[PDB]
Structures are given as C-alpha cells and as structure tokens.
Symmetry: D2
Subunit: 236 residues, 4 copies
C-alpha cells in the first residue's frame, strides 16, 4: 500500500463514494474520499490551469484551478504533511477514464521544492519545468497508458486519432525523488502548476486528472481504474 497525497480535478460525480453531486476539485489525504471539495465547472475543450501550494510552516495545502475568462474554483485543507509523507517522495500526474471518457492532456507542468534550515541558500531544492514533453521523455516514469504525442503534449490516458478511449489509466512521475523532509529540517515547501485539456465530443465525461505525491516506488494500484483515478486500490 502506497501513501498518497493528491489534488483531484474530478470530472464525474461518484456520489456512492462520497463525491459531491457535481464536478469538483478535491484534496486527498490517503483516500479517494477528499478531505475537502469545491464545486468546479469543467469547460469542455478549453485549456485549464491549476496551481498547488504547500508550506510546512503554514501547514495548509491549497489548489486553485481556472480557465481563461476567469472562472476559477479553489480548495484548501489544514494538514501537517510532515507526518503523513515519507522523507523522500515522488511527484506526479495521473488521470483515468472508465465507462465515460475524456482526453486527459497535460500541456505543461512545473514543480518547485525546497528544504531548508539555517540560511537563504537552503540545504535542498529542485525545480523543473515542462512547457512541452519530448517523444521519449527520459526524466518521466510513465505508467499504464501514459505517453507523449507528436504535438509535444502528454496524454495520460489512451487517445486514438485524437479520440479518447474507455477504461484507461496513466501516470507520469518525475524521475528524481524529491527530498521533502529531514531530521534537521526547518521548513519544507512545494509548488506545482500544470495546464490541461479535458475534451470530449460526448458530454458525460470521466474520470479526472490528479496531481499527486507518493512514496518513491509508487505504481498504479491494482483496481485503481475509473473513479479511483489511478491512485487508490479501493474506495477508501
């Protein structure tokens, strides 16, 4: 069993597993059942942006997701990840489709991580930025149906001639582990941005996209398809 922290952009209401009866963004600690959600209106066919934030002093994980036009939803949860996440983790993006389907396309992705103690110049930091993904992205660990198309976009779930398929899971985790805690740590922070394209010719769509933090050796759990977004073995 992995340890998962996630921000979900949930495109299909699964009210049998605790979803609100609407599309939503959620903060997940160790369970598909979000600790907090906010109503979110998916603009089918438009490029969205999501910004995710945490600081071990504030101890508040927050996310905002908006579309051009200025529709934006936000969600926050007070939590001390310090004592949830292992001291080394990997960061990633995952998506799923089930019976209903959508493209789950990542157009760009940024991440910044900091570990500090007794100075400006802090014991550790990582920063990566993709404003396009290459044909063989060697710094991404691709899981399930995740791959990159020739426009330089990362399709987390299967697409056939631009057209999305049923029951697909995919994940991309950055190759290098991220040092999120130490015994001598004073502050830890991370920031993530990604842009995304949820599209379908149909109007009922599923299942969503998540940004997640996990133990370094995390892999798609068995039976994590559709509503579990490739993150959880069961409907926790």
């Amino acid at each position: 069993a992995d340890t998962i922290v996630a921000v979900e952009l949930d495109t299909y209401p699964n009210t049998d597993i605790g979803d609100p009866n609407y599309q939503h963004i959620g903060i997940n600690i160790k369970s598909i059942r979000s600790k907090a959600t906010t109503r979110w209106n998916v603009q089918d066919g438009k490029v969205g942006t999501a910004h995710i934030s945490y600081n071990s002093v504030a101890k508040r994980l927050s996310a905002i997701v908006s579309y051009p036009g200025g529709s934006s939803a936000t969600v926050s949860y007070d939590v001390d990840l310090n004592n949830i996440l292992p001291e080394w983790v990997r960061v990633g993006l995952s998506a799923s489709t089930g019976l209903y389907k959508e493209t789950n396309t990542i157009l760009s992705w940024s991440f910044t991580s900091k570990l500090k103690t007794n100075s400006t110049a802090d014991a550790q930091s990582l920063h990566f930025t993709f404003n396009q993904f290459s044909q063989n992205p060697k710094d991404l660990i691709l899981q399930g149906d995740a791959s990159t198309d020739s426009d330089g976009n990362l399709q987390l779930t299967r697409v056939s001639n631009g057209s999305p398929q049923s029951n697909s899971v995919g994940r991309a985790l950055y190759y290098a582990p991220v040092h999120v805690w130490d015994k001598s740590a004073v502050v830890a922070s991370f920031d993530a941005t990604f842009t995304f394209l949820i599209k379908s010719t149909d109007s009922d769509i599923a299942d969503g996209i998540a940004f997640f933090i996990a133990n370094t050796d995390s892999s798609i759990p068995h039976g994590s398809g559709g509503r579990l977004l490739g993150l959880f073995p069961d409907a926790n």
Copy 2:
C-alpha cells in the same frame, strides 16, 4: 498613513502596548499591536534565520525563525492580504534600539514574489538575493542609520568599532516596487528569508528587527523609534 504588514522579531517586551511579557516573534497588520505572537528566545551572538511566506489562495501569512542546533519559533496569521496592501508595494527590513541596544546585523536577504494567470509562466515575477551587501548598494533605499559595513553586512542600526549605539533606527527597502496583486490575477505569492545577528555585551537588549511590506513611498514615521521598530507613528 503608511500601510504596513510586518513580521517582527521583538527582543524587548513592552506590555503597555500589547506585547507578551517575554521575547516573541509576531505578525503585524497595520499596527504595532500584533495580531499573533509566539514566544521566541534570542540567542545572543548567534546567527539566526527567518523564513516568511504567503500565498493568496491559502491566505495564511506565516514566519519561522530558527537558530542552529534545533531551537525555533513559528507564528502564523490568517489574513487576506488583498484587503490590506496596495497592489504595488516596496519590501524592506527595519530595526531599532532605544535606551537599551543590540547590533541588528543582516547577513543575507532573499525575496521571491510571483503573480499568476493561466500558464506555468508568471504574468510577473521578481526574485532578488543578497548574501553580501556591497559598500554602496544602489538597489537598496537606505533610511535612517542603515548602512552596509566593510565585512559586507547590513547594519540597520548604528555601530562603532563593534559596539551598538542607543536610539538608532534604520531601514533598507528593495529599490524596485513589487506588484503583489492585480484583480486580473489568479494567485499571488511571496517568500522571504533573512539571516541576522543580534548581539550585546549588555544584559538587557532592545528593540528588535522586522521584515515589512509597505506602500512604495514609505519612510520612517516620526517617532517610530524604540518599541515602534521604525514602522509605526504611534502605538495604535
């Protein structure tokens, strides 16, 4: 009226103006009377580090100040900084001494500010670092007794041959105004770190150091010395 947000490292208790009866770090919104404080213990002669954070989605301002070897104090405040600051500001450091005194030596200072819209790109961002201040720093607005020394440190309050002077007040602000929000913006964030050296051969010390965010045209208010940290005209 200036318009001040500040994190104070308050080395001298003034219980007639709301201080706890002990040394503290605090968070000041428009008043020397802190909206929150935490007990903190100055380690005379030692180099300390302060990390200040804020993100407009979490709306939680927070500070932590550590000394090497594991002692540290943290304080945070829930505040929507949009309610309070102008949308352009200047950021700086200030310190004071009264009857009692201490060096207020800044040894390094970093600041990062981001605006955000709909990309991994930043509608705007600024980042500066100083790990040593030059003898004539044209990018700092020096106010009052603030001056840099021949080690390459910033001595906010007067110093002669090592020994601190009484009744000194001094501030340093970064030359460039920072754009801390636009209504046409999705998220705004800043992060500040500084390392400092508070020292006396005396037994009582005063009055402290602050990181502060003020309107662009801010200057030391009349009678803002001593307990007012060179930030406020009165004790309101």
Copy 3:
C-alpha cells in the same frame, strides 16, 4: 556621455553609418557601429524571440533571434564587459521609428543577473520576468513614447489606433539597478529574453529594437531617433 552595451534588431540598413546592406542583428559596444553583425530576416507580423547571453569567464556575449518554424540568426562578440560597464547599471529595451515606421511591440521580457563568489549561493541575484505589462508599470522607468497598451503589451514606439507612427523613440528600463560587477566577484553573468512583434502596412520598415545595459541614470540622448535606436547621441 552614456555608456552602452546593446544587442540590436536593426530593421533598416543605414549603410552611411556602417550597417551592412540588409536587416541584421548587432552587438553594440559604446557605438551604433556594431562590433559584429549577422543577416537577420524580419518576418513582418510574426512574434519573434531574442535570447541574450553573457558570462565573465567565457567573455563572449551572444544573441540569437528566431521565429516559429526554424528561422533564426545568431551573433557573438568576444569582449570583457568588466572593463566597459560600471559596477552598477540598469537594463532596458529601446525602439525607434524615423521616416519609415514599424510597431516595436514587446510581449514578454525576462532578465537574470548573477554575481558569484565561493558558494553555491550567489553574492547577488536579480531575476525578473514580465509576461504582460500592467497599465501603470511602477517597476519600469518609461522614457519617451514608450507606454503599455490595453492588451498588456509594451509599445516602445507610438501607435495610433492600431497603426505605428514615424519619428518615435521609446525605452523601458527596469527600476532596480543591477549589480553587474564587484571586485570580490569571481563570476558575473546575465541572460535576457524578450519576445517582440514587428508589424507594418508599408513595405519599407525602420528602425529596430535593442536590448541594452547602461549606466544607472541613462536617458534618451538628444537626436537619437531613427537609425540611432534611442541609444547614442552621434553615429561615431
């Protein structure tokens, strides 16, 4: 007499003053007469990008400017900017029209300056990016006709409801003085990027755009319209 280093995007060949007989990019030390040029082909109405690069060890200053679809020109000069620039400077963008005219539109601009010593942690960094300029850009010193427009673009040169005007000059300098050199400095570096739109309804266009490093108090010299790119007084 201003001290000037510039990278020019020369859109009009003024051969009487040593331009080569075609549109070009140049490296200007202290004079409108570039110490090196390379053929450059302006694509009227397209968004181009320039990247400028310098490192005090390598002592080569270079620039490349490209349009989408693989069209790009590069110029380099071996030079020791130590012995040319003052310790403190300002950085900016300037543009001009003469009889012949063009839009000198800037869409985004970033700069990074580093001074290093004997650390992973630089003695001094500035880094700014603009991906859109606000309508009162309090952190840019605008000179001459330079202003920002309602789409959040910086128009260095006069535009009258869509259409560019003749005999216009305009510069935009970053408010904060940049510390490009110090004597305890082991390395100094900088990089700049800007994207630009050069558009025109006429066949013959002028005069160009330049990025430039100048003494802190630099202003538009007198009679520096047109071929002199708002940069020099004479043509020597």
Copy 4:
C-alpha cells in the same frame, strides 16, 4: 561506450598521458587528454569553488576554480556540444586516488539546465541545489566508493575517519536524466557550481575531481582508476 564531457581538477601531473607538468584544470571532450588546460594551484586543506558554464549560441564551455583571498584559475574551449552529446545525459561528479591520495569532498553542488524555443518561459528546465547531502541521498546515483558522511558532506573517494584512502574511485550522478537537446530546440544552456575539499597530510596528492556529463546509463568504466578519474577506460 560512455560519451564523456568533463571539467577536471587535476591534482597530479601524469605528463606521459598529455597532462601538463603542474596541477591544472582542464576541459575534457571524450578523452582524458584535455582539449584545454590552465595551471591551477591546489590549496591543501582549503574549501574551493568551481563554476562551469555552457551556452549553445556562444559555443564556449568554460570553468573557473577559485579559493578565498583571490586565487582563481580559468580554462575554456570552443566547442559545439550539440553534436558531441546525446539528446539525454546524466550529470555528475567523479574522482579518484592512486598511490598518492587526498580527500575528494563535495560540500555543495548545484546545476541548471535550459531548453529554449520561442517564449520567455522555455520548453524544458531543470535545477537542483545541494548545500548538504542526506544520509541516504535517494536523488543521487552513488557509484564506486562514493558515499555521504555524517557532516552532510559527499565523499567521492574512500576516507577512513578524517583520512583519505588509496586507490579509490567514486562518482555521484543526479537521478533524473537531463534534456540537453531537442530538434525544436533553439538554445540549450547549462551552469554548474560545486565547492570541494582536497586535503592530505602528505605533500604529493592524487588524483582529482571532475564535473562530467555522460550518457544516461554511464557507470565507472573498467580500469578507470587513478589518473583516468573514473571517467575513461583508457588514456586515448
């Protein structure tokens, strides 16, 4: 085989394989026989700093090695790495001892890489900073004798108590491969800084420290000890 590009801090003159007859820094392209060298004076027991630099427009790889109090040596070489290196690479630090020995201690290491196309915000970027190394650094591929001591330092070659061993080789690579070229790429640059401690009780020391760039799967080649710095299998 491995395709190596390296900057060597060569502490022992092996003149019978091209080394000059003094301690030196050198630029290595695919051979231990440096394409360029400069005389460099090792300071036994002192912390030194290397700054390494490259930019695909300038096509100049340069390194500077300095010690406090004004002792710098610089080397550089005109090369177009574009056509030398693979599209993906790993980056690392290597060192060795032979009969004569030294500590090869890395106190800090940072690295920055960029792939630009046409925006201010580029296609691909990586940056990591270590100002101390963890007890198990999960983001570093440790090879041969490389390991981390309890002071947060990285020991490339074997050291028993405070004492250097004989015939040691060890390397550290960053976990994530680096994207140093793409077909849509317009500019590619990198920058590396590390601080080191070469020390020995005895006067004559060996063999030295390298910053190197290799194909992703690179490991210590057979028989690459001592004078080959754990970089090349032979002295060609």
